[PDB]
Structure formats: structure tokens, C-alpha cells
XYZ file of N, CA and C in Angstrom:
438
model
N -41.218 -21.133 10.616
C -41.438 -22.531 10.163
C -42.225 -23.329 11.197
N -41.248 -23.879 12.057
C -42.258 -24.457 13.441
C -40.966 -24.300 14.541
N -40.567 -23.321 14.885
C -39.710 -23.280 15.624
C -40.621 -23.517 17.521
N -40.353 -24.525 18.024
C -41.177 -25.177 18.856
C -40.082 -25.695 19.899
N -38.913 -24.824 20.335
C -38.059 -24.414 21.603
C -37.662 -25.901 21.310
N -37.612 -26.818 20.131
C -37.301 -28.480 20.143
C -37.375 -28.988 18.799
N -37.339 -28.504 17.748
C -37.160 -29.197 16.582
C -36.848 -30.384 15.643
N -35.549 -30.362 17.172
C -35.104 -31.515 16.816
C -34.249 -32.359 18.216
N -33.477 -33.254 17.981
C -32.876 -33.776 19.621
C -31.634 -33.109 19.203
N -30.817 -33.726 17.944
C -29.359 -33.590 18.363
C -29.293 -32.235 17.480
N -30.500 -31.519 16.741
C -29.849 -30.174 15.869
C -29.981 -29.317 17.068
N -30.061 -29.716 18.036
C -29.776 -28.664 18.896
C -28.596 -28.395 20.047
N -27.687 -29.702 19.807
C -26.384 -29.658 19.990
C -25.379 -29.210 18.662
N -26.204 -29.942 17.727
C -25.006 -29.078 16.290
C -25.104 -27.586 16.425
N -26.402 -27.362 16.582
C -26.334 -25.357 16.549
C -25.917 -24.896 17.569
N -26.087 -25.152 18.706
C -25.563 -24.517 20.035
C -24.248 -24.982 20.301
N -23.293 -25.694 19.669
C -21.762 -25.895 19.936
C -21.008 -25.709 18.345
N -21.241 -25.455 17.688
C -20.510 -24.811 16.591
C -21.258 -23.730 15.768
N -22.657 -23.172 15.939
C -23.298 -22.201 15.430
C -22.924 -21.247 17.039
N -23.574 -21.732 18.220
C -23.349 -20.641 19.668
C -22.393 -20.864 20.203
N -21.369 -22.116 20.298
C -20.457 -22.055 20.722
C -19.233 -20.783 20.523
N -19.988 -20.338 19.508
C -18.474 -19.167 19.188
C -19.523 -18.073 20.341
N -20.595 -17.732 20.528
C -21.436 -16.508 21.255
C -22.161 -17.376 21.897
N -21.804 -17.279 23.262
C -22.810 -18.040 24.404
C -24.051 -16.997 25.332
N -25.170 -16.915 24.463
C -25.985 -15.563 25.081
C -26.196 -15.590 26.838
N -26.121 -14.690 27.473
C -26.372 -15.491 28.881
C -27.450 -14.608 29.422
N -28.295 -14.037 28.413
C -29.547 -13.300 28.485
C -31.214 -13.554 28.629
N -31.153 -14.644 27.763
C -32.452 -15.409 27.260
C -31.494 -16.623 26.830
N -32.195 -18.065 27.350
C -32.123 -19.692 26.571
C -33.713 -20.311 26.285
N -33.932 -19.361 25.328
C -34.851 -20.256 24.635
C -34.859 -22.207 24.239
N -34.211 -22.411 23.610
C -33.530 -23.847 23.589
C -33.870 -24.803 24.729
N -32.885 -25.629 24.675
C -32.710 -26.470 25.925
C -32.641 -25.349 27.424
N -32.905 -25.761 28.276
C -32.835 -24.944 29.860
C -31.230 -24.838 29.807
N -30.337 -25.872 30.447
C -29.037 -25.807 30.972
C -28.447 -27.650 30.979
N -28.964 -28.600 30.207
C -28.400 -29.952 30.439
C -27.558 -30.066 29.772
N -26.916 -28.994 28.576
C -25.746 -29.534 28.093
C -24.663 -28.659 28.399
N -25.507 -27.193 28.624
C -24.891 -25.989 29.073
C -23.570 -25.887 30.642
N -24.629 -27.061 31.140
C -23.654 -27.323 32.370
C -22.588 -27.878 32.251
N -23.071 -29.139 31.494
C -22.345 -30.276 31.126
C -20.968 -30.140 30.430
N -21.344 -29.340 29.607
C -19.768 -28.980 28.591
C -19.527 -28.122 29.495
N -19.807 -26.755 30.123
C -19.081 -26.057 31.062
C -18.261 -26.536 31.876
N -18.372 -27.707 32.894
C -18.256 -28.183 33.257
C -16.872 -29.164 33.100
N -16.827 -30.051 31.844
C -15.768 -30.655 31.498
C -14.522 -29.529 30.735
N -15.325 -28.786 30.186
C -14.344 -27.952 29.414
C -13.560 -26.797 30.581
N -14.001 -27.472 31.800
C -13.511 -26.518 32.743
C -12.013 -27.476 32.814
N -11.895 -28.747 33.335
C -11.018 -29.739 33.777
C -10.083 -30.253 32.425
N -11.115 -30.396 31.748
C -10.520 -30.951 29.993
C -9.545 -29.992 29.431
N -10.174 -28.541 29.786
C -9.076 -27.321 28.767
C -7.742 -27.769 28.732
N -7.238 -28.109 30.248
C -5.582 -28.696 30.587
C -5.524 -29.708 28.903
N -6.614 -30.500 28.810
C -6.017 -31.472 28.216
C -6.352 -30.935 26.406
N -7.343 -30.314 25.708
C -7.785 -29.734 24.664
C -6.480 -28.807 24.635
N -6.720 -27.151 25.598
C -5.735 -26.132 25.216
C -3.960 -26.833 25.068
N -3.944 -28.314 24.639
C -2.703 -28.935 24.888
C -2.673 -28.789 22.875
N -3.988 -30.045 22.695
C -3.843 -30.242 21.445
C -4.271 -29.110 20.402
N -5.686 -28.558 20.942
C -5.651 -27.134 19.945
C -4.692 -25.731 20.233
N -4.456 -25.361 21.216
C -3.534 -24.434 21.282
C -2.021 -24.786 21.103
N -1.550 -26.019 21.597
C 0.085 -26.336 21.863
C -0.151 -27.139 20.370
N -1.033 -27.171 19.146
C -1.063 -27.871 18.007
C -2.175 -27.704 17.226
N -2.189 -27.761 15.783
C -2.892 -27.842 15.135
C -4.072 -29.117 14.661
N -4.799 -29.185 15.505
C -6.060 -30.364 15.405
C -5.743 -31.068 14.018
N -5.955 -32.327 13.117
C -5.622 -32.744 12.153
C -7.020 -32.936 12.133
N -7.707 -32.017 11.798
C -8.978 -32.173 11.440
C -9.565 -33.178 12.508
N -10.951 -34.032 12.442
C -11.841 -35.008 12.757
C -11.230 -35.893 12.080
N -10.812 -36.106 11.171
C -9.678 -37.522 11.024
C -8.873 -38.339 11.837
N -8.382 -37.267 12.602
C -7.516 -38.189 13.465
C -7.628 -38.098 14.997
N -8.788 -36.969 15.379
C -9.728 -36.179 16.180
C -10.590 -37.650 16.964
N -11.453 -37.996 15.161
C -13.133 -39.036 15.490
C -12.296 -40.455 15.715
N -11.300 -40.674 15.455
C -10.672 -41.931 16.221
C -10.119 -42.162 17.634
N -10.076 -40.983 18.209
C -9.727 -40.475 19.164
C -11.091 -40.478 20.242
N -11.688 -39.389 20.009
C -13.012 -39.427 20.789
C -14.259 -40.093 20.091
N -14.665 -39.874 18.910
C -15.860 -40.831 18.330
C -15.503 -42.077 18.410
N -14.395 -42.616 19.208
C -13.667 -44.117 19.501
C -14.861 -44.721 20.753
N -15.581 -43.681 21.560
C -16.184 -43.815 22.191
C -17.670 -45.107 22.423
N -18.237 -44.312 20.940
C -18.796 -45.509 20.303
C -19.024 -46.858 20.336
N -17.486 -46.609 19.289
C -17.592 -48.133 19.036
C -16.768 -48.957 20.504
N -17.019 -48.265 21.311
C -16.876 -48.772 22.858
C -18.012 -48.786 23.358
N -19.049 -47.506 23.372
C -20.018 -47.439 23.965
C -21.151 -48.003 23.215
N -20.830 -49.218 22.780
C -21.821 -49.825 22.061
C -23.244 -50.479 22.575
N -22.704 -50.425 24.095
C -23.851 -50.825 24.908
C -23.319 -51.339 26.642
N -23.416 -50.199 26.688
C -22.655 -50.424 28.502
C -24.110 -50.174 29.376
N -23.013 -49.380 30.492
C -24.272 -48.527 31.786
C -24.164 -47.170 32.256
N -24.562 -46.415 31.368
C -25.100 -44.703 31.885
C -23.420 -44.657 31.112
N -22.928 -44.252 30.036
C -21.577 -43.518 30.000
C -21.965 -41.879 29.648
N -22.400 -41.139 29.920
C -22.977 -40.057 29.492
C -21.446 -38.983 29.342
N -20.319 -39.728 29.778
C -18.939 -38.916 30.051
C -18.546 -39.346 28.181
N -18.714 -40.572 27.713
C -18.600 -40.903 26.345
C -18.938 -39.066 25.190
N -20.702 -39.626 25.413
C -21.467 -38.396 24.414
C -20.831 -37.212 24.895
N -20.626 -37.202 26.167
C -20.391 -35.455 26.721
C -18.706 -35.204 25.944
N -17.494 -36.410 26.055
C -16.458 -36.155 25.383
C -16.789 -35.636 23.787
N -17.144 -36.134 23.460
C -17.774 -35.303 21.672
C -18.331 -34.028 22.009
N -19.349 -34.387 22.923
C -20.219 -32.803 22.651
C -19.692 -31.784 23.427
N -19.088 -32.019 24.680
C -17.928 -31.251 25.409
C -17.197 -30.277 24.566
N -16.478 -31.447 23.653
C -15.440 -31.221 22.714
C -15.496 -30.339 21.790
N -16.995 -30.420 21.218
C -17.427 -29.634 20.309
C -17.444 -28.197 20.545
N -18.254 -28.102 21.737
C -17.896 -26.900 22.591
C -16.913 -25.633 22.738
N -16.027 -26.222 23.492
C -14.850 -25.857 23.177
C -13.902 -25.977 22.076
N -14.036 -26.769 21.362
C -13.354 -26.815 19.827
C -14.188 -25.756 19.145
N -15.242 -25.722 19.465
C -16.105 -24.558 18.504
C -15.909 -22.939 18.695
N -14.769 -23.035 19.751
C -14.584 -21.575 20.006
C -12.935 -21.889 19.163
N -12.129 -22.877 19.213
C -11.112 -22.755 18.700
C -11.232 -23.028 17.068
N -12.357 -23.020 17.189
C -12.569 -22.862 14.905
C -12.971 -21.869 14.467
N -13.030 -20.896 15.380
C -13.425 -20.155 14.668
C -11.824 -19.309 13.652
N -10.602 -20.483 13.778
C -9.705 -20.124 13.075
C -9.597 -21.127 11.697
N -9.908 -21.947 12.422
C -9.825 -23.371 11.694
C -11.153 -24.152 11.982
N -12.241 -23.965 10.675
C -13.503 -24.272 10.224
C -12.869 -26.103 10.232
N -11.823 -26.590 9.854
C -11.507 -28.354 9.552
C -12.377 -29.329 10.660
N -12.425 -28.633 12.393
C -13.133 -29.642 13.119
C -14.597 -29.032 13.265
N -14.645 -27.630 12.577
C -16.110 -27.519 12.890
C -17.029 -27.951 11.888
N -17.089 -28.837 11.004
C -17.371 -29.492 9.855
C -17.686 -30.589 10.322
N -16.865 -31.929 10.597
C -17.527 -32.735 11.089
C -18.178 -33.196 12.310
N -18.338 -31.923 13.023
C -18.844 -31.888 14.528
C -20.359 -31.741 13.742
N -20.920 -31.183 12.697
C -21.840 -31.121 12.118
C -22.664 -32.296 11.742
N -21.382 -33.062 10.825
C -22.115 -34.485 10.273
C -21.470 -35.505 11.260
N -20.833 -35.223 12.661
C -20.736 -36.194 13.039
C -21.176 -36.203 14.256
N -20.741 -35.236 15.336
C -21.799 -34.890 16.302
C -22.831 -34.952 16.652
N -23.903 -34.748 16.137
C -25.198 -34.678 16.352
C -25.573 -35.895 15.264
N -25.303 -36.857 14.634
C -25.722 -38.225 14.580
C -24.893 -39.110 14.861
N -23.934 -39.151 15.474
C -23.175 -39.859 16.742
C -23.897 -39.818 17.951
N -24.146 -38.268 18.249
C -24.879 -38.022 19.732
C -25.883 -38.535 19.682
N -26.640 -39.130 19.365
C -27.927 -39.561 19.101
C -27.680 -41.337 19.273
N -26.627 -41.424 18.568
C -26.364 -42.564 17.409
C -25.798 -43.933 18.649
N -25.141 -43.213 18.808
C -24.604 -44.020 20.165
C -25.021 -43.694 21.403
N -25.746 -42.692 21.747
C -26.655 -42.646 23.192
C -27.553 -43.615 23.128
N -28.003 -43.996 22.093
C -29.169 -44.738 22.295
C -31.069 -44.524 21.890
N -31.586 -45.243 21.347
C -32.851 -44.481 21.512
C -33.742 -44.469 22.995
N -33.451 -45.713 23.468
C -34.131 -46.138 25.039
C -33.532 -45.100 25.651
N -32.197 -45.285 25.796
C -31.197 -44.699 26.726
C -31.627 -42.677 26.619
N -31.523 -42.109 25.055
C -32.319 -40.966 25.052
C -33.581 -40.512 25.426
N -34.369 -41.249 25.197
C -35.804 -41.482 25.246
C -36.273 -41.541 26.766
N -35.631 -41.980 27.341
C -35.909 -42.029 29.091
C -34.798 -40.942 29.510
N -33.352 -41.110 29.800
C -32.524 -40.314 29.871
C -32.463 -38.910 29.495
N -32.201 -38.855 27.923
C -32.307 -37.409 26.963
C -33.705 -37.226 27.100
N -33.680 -36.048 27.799
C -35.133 -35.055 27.889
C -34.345 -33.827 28.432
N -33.324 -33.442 28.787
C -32.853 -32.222 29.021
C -32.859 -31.747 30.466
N -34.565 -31.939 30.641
C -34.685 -31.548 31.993
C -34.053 -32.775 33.303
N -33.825 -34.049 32.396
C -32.946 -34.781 33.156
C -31.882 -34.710 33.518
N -30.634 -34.866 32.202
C -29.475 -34.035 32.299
C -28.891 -32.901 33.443
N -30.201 -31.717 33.027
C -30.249 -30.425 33.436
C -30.214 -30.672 35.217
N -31.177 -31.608 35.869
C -31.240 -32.137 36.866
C -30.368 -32.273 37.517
N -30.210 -33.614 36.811
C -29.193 -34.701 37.234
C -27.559 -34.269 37.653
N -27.113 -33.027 36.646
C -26.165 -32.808 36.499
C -25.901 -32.159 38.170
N -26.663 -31.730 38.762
C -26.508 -31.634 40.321
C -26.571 -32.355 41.417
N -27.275 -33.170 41.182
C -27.849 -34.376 41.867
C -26.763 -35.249 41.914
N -26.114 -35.594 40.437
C -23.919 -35.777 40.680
C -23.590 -36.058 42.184
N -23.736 -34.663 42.445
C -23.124 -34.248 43.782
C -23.303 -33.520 44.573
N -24.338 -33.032 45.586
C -25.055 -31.866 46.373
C -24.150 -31.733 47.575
């Protein structure tokens, strides 16, 4: 079609956290380099304590009671300074929730229609547009802390 390593901004968090999230290739990343790759690695390293609580010690109640929870972010992050810990809680989430659906498809559904136009939706277009380029992220995510 026009597959152009960028298609799109956020279909490439819907496919790579609930299409690759179940198979993380660590061979070839065509895709993005590593800005989200780190990023969810990263939280889902510290977060598991708090996720392997509600998906393993419980059954997720779907994104119903999930997107009030973390897509709460939002309608917080309606316009602050740099929350990139906000988007990363969803897309983090997705992440690792996307390996725990593969029992239960209920949160990998609206990580689809809600994820990736949330992630977008509430990052911002300025805030993406300067910020979201990947190779920033990808950067930045070291630069954190050297």
C-alpha cells in the first residue's frame, strides 16, 4: 500500500501494544526506533507491582472501569507542562495489558478505539508535533538521567 516505516502517529502504538505487544521481535524494528519501546519497558518494569495486582490478583472490568481510572488522565491533562507519564500510563498500560489479553480480548478492544485517539488526543497537536517525533522520546528517554 504505502507502508513508509510511519503511516500513521498513533496506529503505530495501537499495532505495536495490542497487535506486538503479545510478540516483541528483538531482531529487526522497522517502525518507530525505541521511544515507546523504552518507555513502556520501562514503567511496566516498576508499574507490574501495581498492574500484576489488578490483572493477575483480578479480573480487569474491562476499559469501563479501567478508562476512568487511567484515561482520567485527560481530562486532567487538559493542558499542563510536559506530562508524558499521563500518555505513557495508557500506552504503558496497553503494553502490558496486551500481554495479559491475550486471555481476555475485553481491554484489548478499547486500547484500540481508545488508545491511539486519546494518545494523540490529549498529547496535543503542538505538544506532538514538536515533542512526538520518536526520535525525541527515543532520546530523551536517556537524557531523563545519564
Amino acid at each position: 500500500m504505502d507502508e513508509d516505516v510511519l503511516p500513521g502517529e498513533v496506529l503505530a502504538i495501537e499495532g505495536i501494544f495490542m497487535a506486538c505487544g503479545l510478540n516483541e521481535p528483538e531482531y529487526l524494528y522497522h517502525p518507530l526506533l525505541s521511544p515507546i519501546k523504552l518507555y513502556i519497558t520501562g514503567l511496566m518494569r516498576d508499574k507490574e507491582s501495581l498492574f500484576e495486582a489488578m490483572l493477575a490478583n483480578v479480573r480487569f472490568h474491562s476499559t469501563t472501569g479501567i478508562d476512568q481510572l487511567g484515561l482520567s488522565m485527560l481530562q486532567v491533562s487538559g493542558d499542563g507542562n510536559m506530562n508524558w507519564g499521563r500518555a505513557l500510563a495508557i500506552l504503558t498500560f496497553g503494553s502490558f495489558v496486551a500481554q495479559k489479553l491475550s486471555n481476555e480480548p475485553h481491554l484489548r478492544d478499547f486500547a484500540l478505539a481508545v488508545l491511539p485517539a486519546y494518545a494523540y488526543e490529549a498529547i496535543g497537536p503542538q505538544w506532538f508535533r514538536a515533542r512526538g517525533g520518536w526520535r525525541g522520546l527515543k532520546a530523551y528517554c536517556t537524557q531523563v538521567l545519564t
